[PDB]
Amino acid sequence: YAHFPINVSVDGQNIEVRNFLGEKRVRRQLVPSSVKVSQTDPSKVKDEIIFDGNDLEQVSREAAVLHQMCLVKKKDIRKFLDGIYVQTKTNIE
RNA sequence: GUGAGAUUGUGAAGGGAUCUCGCAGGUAUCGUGAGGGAAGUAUGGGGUAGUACGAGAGGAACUCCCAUGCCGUGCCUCUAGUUUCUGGGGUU
Ligand SMILES: [Mg+2]
Numbered sequence: 001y002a003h004f005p006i007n008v009s010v011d012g013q014n015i016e017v018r019n020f021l022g023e024k025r026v027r028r029q030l031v032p033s034s035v036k037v038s039q040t041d042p043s044k045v046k047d048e049i050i051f052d053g054n055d056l057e058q059v060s061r062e063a064a065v066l067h068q069m070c071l072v073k074k075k076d077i078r079k080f081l082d083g084i085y086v087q088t089k090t091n092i093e
Numbered sequence: 094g095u096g097a098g099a100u101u102g103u104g105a106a107g108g109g110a111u112c113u114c115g116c117a118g119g120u121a122u123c124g125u126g127a128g129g130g131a132a133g134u135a136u137g138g139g140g141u142a143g144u145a146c147g148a149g150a151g152g153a154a155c156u157c158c159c160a161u162g163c164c165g166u167g168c169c170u171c172u173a174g175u176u177u178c179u180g181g182g183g184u185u
Contacts, residue, residue, distance in 0.1 A: 003145065022145060025156045074154075079146080 001082045006070070008049055010039045020070050021082055027069040035062050052092055
């Protein structure tokens, strides 16, 4: 983000992202039981949400459901570079 | 088989055969829902916010409330309209 801290809540499988570009809308995703949702503390990494499971295309599916809720609408996306972006794809073991 | 009719072109009482269909439904209520029809559509305000963005000039948006235009289906408590209740009165 550029100006507004994106606040991503994680309780259970549910995930709530608020304050995306200062909007008052809350965006809601119900992650399946096959994928676990974690969150790194801001001591180590600034803001990371962790999607882990066994199916590749259920972990990759949920990380792009999350990417596409937070899309900039009716402004220039070259200037408004805000969102939730996948940077790394790893294993657990 | 059993009931009911008819055989009406030349008089009458008789009674033979034959043909036609009647022989099981009527009445009353609660539902099914195929198929067909098919509808709601727009707007402004509040705050978000003078914030995002921007050198400045300027200048957004969603959740969320509050109303409104056009349309639709009704309704008659109120208000308004209508009076051959010629209702009560007035007046030529
Ligand atoms: Mg239908």
